[PDB]
Design a binder for this molecule. Structure first.
Ligand SMILES: [Mg+2]
Ligand SMILES: [Mg+2]
Ligand SMILES: [Zn+2]
Lengths: 132, 337, 62
RNA sequence: AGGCUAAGGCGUGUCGGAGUAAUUCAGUUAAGGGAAUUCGGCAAAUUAGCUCCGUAACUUCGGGAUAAGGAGUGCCUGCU
RNA sequence: GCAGCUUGCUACCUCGAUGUCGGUUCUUUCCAUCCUGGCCGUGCAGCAGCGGCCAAGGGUGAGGUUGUUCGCCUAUUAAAGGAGAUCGUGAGCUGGGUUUAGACCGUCGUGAGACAGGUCGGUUACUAUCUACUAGAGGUGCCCGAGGUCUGCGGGUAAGCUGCUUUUAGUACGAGAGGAACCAAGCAGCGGCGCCACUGGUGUACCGGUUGUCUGACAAGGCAUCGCCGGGCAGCUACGCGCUCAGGAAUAAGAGCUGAAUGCAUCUAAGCUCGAACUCUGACCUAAAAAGAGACCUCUUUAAGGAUUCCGGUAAAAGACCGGUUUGAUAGAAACGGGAUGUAAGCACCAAGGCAACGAGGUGUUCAGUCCGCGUUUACUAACCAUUCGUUCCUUUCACUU
């Protein structure tokens, strides 16, 4: 996809549980796999900020529960550096349920999201309220 | 057997991995001359690292036109002396040294490396070389230079380092004339490299002594229940039943570090003259403070501090002429704590 | 270079260094080192430790 | 009990020096993730004393039961 | 017909023992090609397919059941190819299955017992003699003696491989729906080599708080895993950072030119031109012990120079290597700069209280005290004093010397 100005470590790991931060109707998801990732032997797939990955809904409304979907990471607790020299970090990981293009199913996002996903996916930028 | 494929561990393009036979990097290939006469190399001593804030100007880059932070290595480069001229002859069995003429005036501290040559033939030897080139026997000319580490303070040694460089021109006669003009003089780093250009660096890397397969080749440890059965950092198998031998491509333990390595396309960001512009408070750790002229190199450079770094103009560069970087701030914070 | 001040020790950040800790609500804090970050995450208030600048401010009128 | 000291018995659970590699026996710590490792949570970690509140399905009515799940605890001054 | 990668057939070797199945680790080989490179045909408009030819350089992964190989299934992916190496690999590992002794269930037997059926349990020995390989040293050979700088007979390499997005372009093509390619740019995954300015880990130097106890109390200390908890410099390190190309020559399948046998025609019979991630060259690492055992220069043959002693570290398992030695900042002390922790002891005032004695604690002296395996200045102490090879040794087997 389009390159990002910043450098993002791949913090979250395939098997991780994230707290989805939208109003689609799910609370917790389970990262199954990461789009556009080959890998090598013995290495678990991993995902970072602005990575589209397929998940599974673990806690939420009955109709949404047990559904394989697509989502991207908007925050991560593992630090990453700006182009001009600085390190940014968060208190908690987060994710939003979206489509293949990037339109998020939710029309409201809670909490801040990293500006780099805002530049990569403009729709997440517009749907958010506070960007840091 | 359903095998899972894995790329080979480590690189065999650098074997055998043994200690370098000298403490001075030697160049095997010289570039093709594309301009006026000049030396193709230079020498200096590594000091340490800092970072600078420069307006980005790399063409087509994402971060163009905005500030960025870059790591830079500071290298001390006192002026060198061109001490001799060497002539080579081409035949079936490759080049062969056929003549040398030394300069009349030399530094008294060169006696520590070799006994000082005495001023015998200077004009007659040079005209001898000229006659050889006139009769079409000589093919190329190389210059012999040495460093003068007595002016520095962070480098304990006081004995010069001798090495051979190359002259860049489009004809043998021009090379000979330029070598005659510059023989027995001092050449500053500015006379060789222009600010903003690319260079190639060579040096002996840091030595780690004898190391095992895990840290020498990056093989996998023993996992799970096998991690507490007796062999954790040893290699899995030394070979098959047949052939009945251990291959040279199997990872084993031995010397690690202190080899010769080359880095490509390192950019020169600033040619300085006064050392107060790079010295942090308290000086560099284990070195001291800079006293002469220096040079800033983008990125990292092989070898530790107080190691000799050789520089030559690029041999496999792609990009066109870049331009003078715009340095805004050079960090002089304490490296300590 | 833009000048940003450390939240805990009240010290200017050298360019090319420092950190940025963003909170769940959205509040942002600037940390100049690991000492400030560690004392922040531990629970200390800048007003109470007197090696910080704010602590000096309360101790001047003490 | 475990820890720290008396009396009593010892420096003899009878090889020393030097301090610099890999590897090995037994330990301390580890960002982000949290069983994705493996035949299998093997191994290691978590919890842990005392007081108070509260305590399920089932039941041979004896139990289950320390169920589960929460709160308090130092030092100083004066007392009942 | 080929292969010996499934199962059979035989009984040539091994019963004074060649340690079984599967998985794990690591290395390599084959091509009968799954992807990546190049071509041909089509019932090939474009996109995407179907079939065949050359090509083994690189890639070929993560998970659920099962001891499993095999096989089924899940979400990615350019694709998630198949075989060989004593069904590679137990003086490397594991012990799940099979294959001992114990017991249960079903079926056989009159019974001891059996199953080719199921289930639970069940010891993994050794100090490396030879050779091979990975690294480090000492000799002897070539050679005027010593030192330096080079060449390069050779050896090695994947040092890079592969995707996504943007432009070309909503263009060619197509009725529309749909929809490419040459060049150009960035980013990413994996691999390789390095480094420590920034971030993270450790940091049994160091600073602080505190529990139990001991040295009579304060002060300062011992022991309890560094007693435990908090912070952390230097160094080491990755989860951090830097670099990571072509161009050319000769070719395979294949496409052509010229051209006769066979007046014509024909890519072939001579001859010639193009043509791949293959091969060679070019980058990169190593290499005079290259027996054709090298070239050049300088200094000097009772010397040049080399070693040992001495002060050290860019180096280091021992050896080796790289520096200094009074004509000197090589190591240490002193002071200062730069840092770590967090405001020392005593003294004064206040303190909930208490007739009083005492009083946890707070404020001031005090960014204090304590410490620095970092730098600067400075000969203040130590780098002094010497030995040894560059003579076969004695003999006058001597060109010497009493
Ligand atoms: Mg001993
Ligand atoms: Mg074996
Ligand atoms: Zn701060």
């Amino acid at each position: 996809m389009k390159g990002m100005r910043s450098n993002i470590p791949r913090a979250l790991n395939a098997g991780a549980q994230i707290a989805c931060v939208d109003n689609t109707g799910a609370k917790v998801v389970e990262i199954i796999s990461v789009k556009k990732y080959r890998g090598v032997k013995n290495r678990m797939p991993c995902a970072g900020i602005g990575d589209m990955c397929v998940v599974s809904v673990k806690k939420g409304t009955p109709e949404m529960r047990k559904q394989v979907l697509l989502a991207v990471v908007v925050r991560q607790k593992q630090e990453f550096r700006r182009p001009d020299g600085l390190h940014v970090s968060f208190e908690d990981n987060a994710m939003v349920i979206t489509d293949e293009e990037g339109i998020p199913k939710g029309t409201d996002i809670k909490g801040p999201v990293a500006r780099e996903v805002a530049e990569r996916f403009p729709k997440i930028g517009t749907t958010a309220s506070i960007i840091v | 057997m359903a095998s899972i494929h894995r790329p080979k561990r480590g690189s065999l393009a650098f074997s055998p991995r043994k200690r370098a036979k000298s403490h001075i990097p030697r160049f095997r290939a010289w570039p093709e001359a594309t301009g006026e006469p000049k030396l193709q190399s230079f020498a200096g001593y590594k000091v340490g690292m800092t970072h600078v804030i420069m307006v980005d100007d790399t063409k087509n880059s994402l971060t163009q036109g905005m500030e960025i932070s870059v790591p830079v290595t500071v290298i001390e480069t006192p002026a060198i002396r061109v001490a001799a001229i060497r002539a080579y002859a081409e035949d079936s069995t490759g080049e062969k040294a056929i003549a040398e003429v030394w300069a009349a005036d030399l530094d008294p501290e060169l006696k520590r490396r070799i006994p000082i040559p005495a001023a015998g033939n200077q004009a007659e030897a040079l005209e001898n070389i000229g006659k050889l080139i006139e009769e079409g026997r000589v093919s190329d000319v190389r210059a012999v230079i040495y460093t003068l580490p007595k002016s520095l303070t962070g480098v304990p040694k006081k004995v010069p380092d001798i090495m051979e460089s190359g002259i860049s021109a489009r004809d043998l006669g021009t090379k000979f004339e330029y070598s005659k003009t510059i023989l027995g003089t001092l050449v500053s780093v500015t006379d060789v490299f222009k600010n903003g250009t690319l260079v190639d660096t060579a040096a002996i890397t840091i030595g780690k002594g004898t190391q095992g397969p895990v840290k020498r080749w990056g093989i996998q440890l023993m996992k799970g229940k096998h991690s507490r059965q007796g062999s954790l950092r040893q290699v899995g198998t030394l070979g098959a039943f047949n052939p009945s031998r251990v291959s040279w491509r199997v990872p084993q333990m031995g010397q690690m570090g202190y080899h010769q390595r080359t880095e490509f396309n390192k950019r020169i960001l600033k040619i300085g003259s006064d050392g107060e512009e790079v010295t942090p408070e308290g000086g560099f750790i284990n070195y001291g403070l800079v006293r002469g002229d220096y040079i800033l190199i983008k990125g990292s450079v092989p070898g530790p501090s107080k190691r000799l770094i050789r520089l030559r103009d690029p041999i496999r560069a792609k990009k066109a002429d870049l331009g003078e970087p715009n340095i805004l701030y050079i960090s002089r914070e304490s490296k300590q704590g | 270079m833009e000048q940003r001040k450390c939240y805990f020790c009240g010290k200017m950040l050298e360019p090319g260094t420092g950190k940025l800790y963003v909170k769940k609500d959205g509040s942002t804090y600037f940390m100049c080192s690991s000492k400030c970050m560690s004392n922040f995450a531990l629970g200390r208030l800048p007003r109470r430790t007197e090696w910080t600048e704010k602590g000096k401010i309360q101790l001047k009128k003490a």
